[PDB]
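Hey,

Quick one before I head out. I ran the complex with A1IGY overnight. Inputs first:
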Amino acid sequence: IYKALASPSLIALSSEDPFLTAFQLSWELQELSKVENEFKAEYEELSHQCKHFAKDLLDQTRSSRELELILNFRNELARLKLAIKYRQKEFVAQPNCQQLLASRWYDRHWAGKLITCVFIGLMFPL
Amino acid sequence: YQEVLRNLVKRYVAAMIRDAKTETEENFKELKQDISSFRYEVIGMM
Amino acid sequence: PLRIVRAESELSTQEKSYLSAVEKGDYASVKLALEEAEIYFKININCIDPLGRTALLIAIENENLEIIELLLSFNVYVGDALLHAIRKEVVGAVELLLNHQFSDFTPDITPIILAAHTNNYEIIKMLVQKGVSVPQPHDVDSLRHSRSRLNIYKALASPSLIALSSEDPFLTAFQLSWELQELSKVENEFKAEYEELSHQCKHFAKDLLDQTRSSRELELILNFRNELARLKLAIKYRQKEFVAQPNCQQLLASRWYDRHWAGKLITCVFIGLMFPLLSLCYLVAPKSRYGLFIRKPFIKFICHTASYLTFLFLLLLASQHIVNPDRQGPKPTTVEWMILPWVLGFIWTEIKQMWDGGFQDYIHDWWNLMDFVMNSLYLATISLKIVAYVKYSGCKPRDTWEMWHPTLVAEAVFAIANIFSSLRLISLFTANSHLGPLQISLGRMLLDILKFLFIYCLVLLAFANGLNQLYFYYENSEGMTCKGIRCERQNNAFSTLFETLQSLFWSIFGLISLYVTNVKADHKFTEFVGATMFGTYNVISLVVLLNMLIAMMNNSYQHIADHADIEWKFARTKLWMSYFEEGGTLPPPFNINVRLNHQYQEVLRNLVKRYVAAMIRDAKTETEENFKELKQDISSFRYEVIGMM
Amino acid sequence: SSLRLISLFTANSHLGPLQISLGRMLLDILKFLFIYCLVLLAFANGLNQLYFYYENSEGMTCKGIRCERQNNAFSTLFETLQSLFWSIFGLISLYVTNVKADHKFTEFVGATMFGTYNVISLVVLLNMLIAMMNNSYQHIADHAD
Amino acid sequence: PLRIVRAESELSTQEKSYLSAVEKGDYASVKLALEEAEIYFKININCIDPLGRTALLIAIENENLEIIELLLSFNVYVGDALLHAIRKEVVGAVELLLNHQFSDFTPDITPIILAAHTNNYEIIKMLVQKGVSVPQPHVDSLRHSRSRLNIYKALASPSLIALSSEDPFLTAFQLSWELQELSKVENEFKAEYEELSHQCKHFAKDLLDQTRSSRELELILNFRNELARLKLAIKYRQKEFVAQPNCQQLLASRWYDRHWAGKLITCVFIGLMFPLLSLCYLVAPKSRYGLFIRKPFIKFICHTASYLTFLFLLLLASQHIVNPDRQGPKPTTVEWMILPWVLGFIWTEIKQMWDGGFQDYIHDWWNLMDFVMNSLYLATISLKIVAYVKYSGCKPRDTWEMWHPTLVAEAVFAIANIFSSLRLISLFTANSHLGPLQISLGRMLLDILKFLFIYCLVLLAFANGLNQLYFYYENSEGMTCKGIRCERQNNAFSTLFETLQSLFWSIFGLISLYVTNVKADHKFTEFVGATMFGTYNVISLVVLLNMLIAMMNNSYQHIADHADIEWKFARTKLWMSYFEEGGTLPPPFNINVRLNHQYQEVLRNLVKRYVAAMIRDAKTETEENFKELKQDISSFRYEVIGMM
Ligand SMILES: Cn1c(=O)n(CCCO)c(=O)c2c1nc(Oc1ccc(/N=N\c3ccccc3)c(OC(F)(F)F)c1)n2Cc1ccc(Cl)cc1
Ligand SMILES: Cn1c(=O)n(CCCO)c(=O)c2c1nc(Oc1ccc(/N=N\c3ccccc3)c(OC(F)(F)F)c1)n2Cc1ccc(Cl)cc1
Ligand SMILES: Cn1c(=O)n(CCCO)c(=O)c2c1nc(Oc1ccc(/N=N\c3ccccc3)c(OC(F)(F)F)c1)n2Cc1ccc(Cl)cc1
């Protein structure tokens, strides 16, 4: 039953939210590999393919407006903070999401960066 | 959100069908297509 | 759950038979199903399969040109069909389509870019013939701006497009790999993709160079624009695959060399013995008998090497007791006068190479900053010795000298100076085929150790701070003529931060005893805490950190040792190229184009036209070559049968 | 005479392959000696050049590193080449870097050079001999029968 | 040189067309050539090829059945075409051939043996239905060695075992055992026999995987008391059979019959009161607390809690509260409480050695360790009693002479305490994390013991050399101590015993440098001795002790590859020791008309499922898209020839 619910072609066809139903279905398949340790390599391998489905579905974004809408659904970056609670490592470590995060973060060569870093650090009370 | 998600799902399906149908299984389809075309032409000639 | 199909509109009745006939290849059925010209029974010729496929697109994927031509004659909507044909690598479909909202391709993709990405020689030629142009690679919606830039750099860096529309394919494969290498450091997210695009440009030059048929063509390429002017440009661009080719390496070895294990070392030593003879011979009469015998690079190298072992031999003889007792501010001895010429020659060579490069890519090397430090130390030795002579005199016992005396500092600096000089003799291993690759791989397994030095230098500081904080209140120096860990009864290991830092260092080698953690009081609680912190430091460093330094120097000797012959040969070529020119043929002791373009562009065309042939007629075969045999048999049988009736 | 009994191990099905594979990862060690012998010579030259001015043999029965109260460790080149070899196994103490004078500058330089030699040969040079013997045993075991 | 053709001839000028006719395939020409050559027309229908292919050997090669029928209609020599058809896996050709000097096969390969080699169900079926019989395995040495290996390859084919064996499970256990032993006495053909044994072990695993209910599984393992066949699969070392997920889910429900810190507290609490449960098992064993020590999981915890209490008594025997110094003392209070545990251990070993007296008893490490520990305890008990009846009285301990019984008894008792606490290691197989670690660390130890035959040789050689050099300078004047275990070490190399002791403590750097001096001004022998000591220190730690860690890495990868079936096998062996009755009290205490038809039905269903799975896993796989292309044109050909 879990091998059928965790098929990419069925999630896309008959799910209201293919992103949310792939976060949940990979969390259950990871905590169910500890109660069924006899069938352990089959339950956790079934969970590793639900993480790649979300990564491949987010990989289809074409512009920076589609990507911004997805990560801010339901304060800001609400969907990205939800993908961290479920330990979606492939979802977060994507070039487009990393580029957006870097653009929010930063808001030269080796010998010119640490100089201004120390310059800013010296005046931290100022 | 739904308008973006529909496009995402559609273009994921359109890529998965390509990557599944094409990937040397593509070469086998062409041989069958040629055989079927030749058979149909022969049947329609006589 | 009650699973349902969500977000799917519909399909139609008649169109299913149409699509089935198109897919099955029935020409007549599609022919009659298309004959509702301008009077249609509500059948849409632009019907879409639920999978997105269309009748025009279905015929493209089956490459049945009869149905394709029939559909094209009926004014079927095309859309992005040319791009699909280009990606599917069907020549006939592209030929037919070239003379006449949901999109499957990125909006910034053009047919020329896609064709270059597919690397198809025929389609690229056909597109270029009709007239095309790639945009200029040269910020609001940064997602598609960074994606567009990568698409055009992937088209330019393609072997089939480069050698069809480039004046000099050898020169454009050097600038392109260099630009993609430095473009992967400003785009950290797409780093893994830019540096792979650069790697296929380096192999393209090597593959193109491998088509030379004789030594006449090979030397025409390397000498373009004084001598070997296109082999110094490859080294300037770090084209390691281009340089380390057998055809080029054999030519370089012939230029260099211009016998068995027991017969080669003896004659090399014999040649090196007469080092000072054929240097004054060159100075007096530069003749073919002796003056031109040092001009052979293999002989110059030996002479420059045998002149360095002489420097070290009397460097070991400068510390013998036989050769200025304990006299304060002494005059230079008989050995340092012999030392001075070599030092002066090294300093002059460094000075002359300083202004020739402008401190760029000159101080950026491991073996060229050790020289700077060594020469600075050698200059400071003289600077202190001359100062000692002019302001001190008289014989005074050494045990009575006050600390920081100029003589002691000068001799300490001199002793430090001549360690780098002997350690620089390591860079002469690249010339040997056995010790060469081993030495090169050792120096690249040492930039990872440098990263395992910000963990240890933080653990050491963290533990030293705590140990000093605990033990700084118990210091004493009464009844002790000797203080510190560097004595026979270590007493004050953890008294000061400077002493604590250097007492936790020697504990790695087991040279710090256990009684150093006691105090001159019966406070067993403090002593136990100190011993526990010392033991905890010993566990972390000697068991955890130093057992995973060797475990990460074993997952880095499988990548480094993978491609090691290329690196060693590149280094050996860089070593050889320094003994080819004129100007440096003096040991420090004795130192103190209308037609050329025609020929080049004529051989270049042959090289390109051989590469493209040896690429196509190998890509065809590399199981696929026999798939077309069955189709050929089927086509012949069909044509014969049809023509018969 | 007693070290030729290992040549009879090529008759046992268990000890046979081990000896053959052990004698093949031994030309790799020989190539690694040519770097240690240069580092040792360089550091011995430096230490002797620093310390040869302080030789003394007054009021001492023994002289060198092979007695209970080690002294005159870096007075000559022979004793310096011996002192840097026994420091690999930790058999050389730390009070041999002192002199019968209050010259703390030269003692600190000698100690720093001794520590630098210890670092290079024990954590940078003996971890690359393990790393390159571990990646050379796999090739020998492919064709060892 | 001039390249020529050596020892070869020409075929023909008119037979080349005849051979090409069957090479391309055309009934008209092929038939005509044979028909027109009936009356001795010098065509030699039994042609030859540069590859050595006759006319019959070409139609069979291309599997064309019509050509084979046409050729076999006439009188054509067959020779060994049957074996070629069997090897080529052509069912039609062998069917036609069955009812109808230079050879490519050794003169011992019968068609049945070759078919078993090919491992095809239908051809073997056809051959067996006709009636065949392989020989029974038991001058020309080369012939005889390639005459028993061919037989065992035929006997170990799954298709033949599943078709002509009364019990495929028994015939898979015993066949792999015989092949495994044969790999030893047959050193040349070692790799071939060992692969057959691993082939037979996977057959039982594959046949067991075709069970679809727990009822069918219990009928296989309990056949011919409880879990009768599961214990037989361990006597034959079937690690793959035991470590099946179903056989591990079944055993877990018999064993057990939550977060970590909700189970650790439960375990420590249930082990806290083992004596209560042990008493209740012997005074009121009806329901409440008498059969609560009968669950194997609870029994395992109670037995562990008794062993931990035994160790806690050994750690209280060294306390000073529990001690004068007098010859032959009366046993203390702790020893009286330790005696029951030793008696229980010895009695348990005595009542477990009767299955075979030293027969496969001393094969595993733990049995030998237990035997050594029990011998040491017996010797301690004997010496402490010997010392009581004769060597009595009070006297200061430092005045006692060595070899006194009260000293040897204490030494032996102290040596036996090390082995008692090392037996606690074997209880790690029951844990999920520490389990596989112990097995990998216990199988990566026979390699270490192979380096100790070279290290010991090097040690002996260097010790002999050093002793021969230094034995003339022995001195014992003004010395209270004599040896390397003194504050001022001396006489380190004066004798072979001390020489062997000194060269061992130098591995850890506990031997000072000044031990290489002599009470003389002989400065040439001192340098030679120091050079020998340094040379030993060179190849003992840099060369010989770095090749030990270099080969652990290249053997741990092989061990850790398949290191989960072995842990499960060990855990099952540990579990099944707590299932049977007898020995349920800790050491402190206790001092077939039917059922042969259901099994047959289940076995035949399993064989049917196995064959129906193997045929589909072999025929289909990328070979499914090759037979379809044949049908695609065969239907069209039939349609065309219907209308023509
Ligand atoms: C840090 N320390 C320490 O300074 N002194 C010296 C203090 C006085 O000089 C110890 O005597 C000591 C200790 N630690 C100990 O027991 C271990 C040992 C290893 C551990 N770990 N890892 C490794 C890893 C690799 C090699 C060796 C050890 C470990 O850590 C643990 F895992 F958390 F338990 C705990 N003892 C011994 C001791 C003394 C008294 C008692 Cl009652 C109990 C134990
Ligand atoms: C070479 N030396 C040395 O001879 N003596 C003896 C002289 C006194 O008798 C030191 O006392 C010493 C030292 N080096 C040190 O500090 C380190 C140590 C290790 C480093 N690195 N790696 C390894 C790797 C493996 C094993 C061990 C070390 C390192 O790395 C660096 F920061 F990049 F330099 C820096 N100290 C201690 C010290 C003294 C004074 C100060 Cl102010 C600060 C520190
Ligand atoms: C065997 N011996 C020795 O007994 N004494 C003590 C005698 C007096 O007590 C040495 O002083 C010594 C030595 N050998 C040396 O030189 C090496 C060093 C390392 C070698 N090898 N490997 C390794 C591997 C890893 C780490 C370090 C070294 C090696 O190669 C060898 F032949 F295989 F040993 C030879 N020296 C030093 C020396 C002193 C005086 C002179 Cl004039 C010349 C040289």
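DSSP finds six helices and no strands in chain D.

Talk tomorrow,
K.
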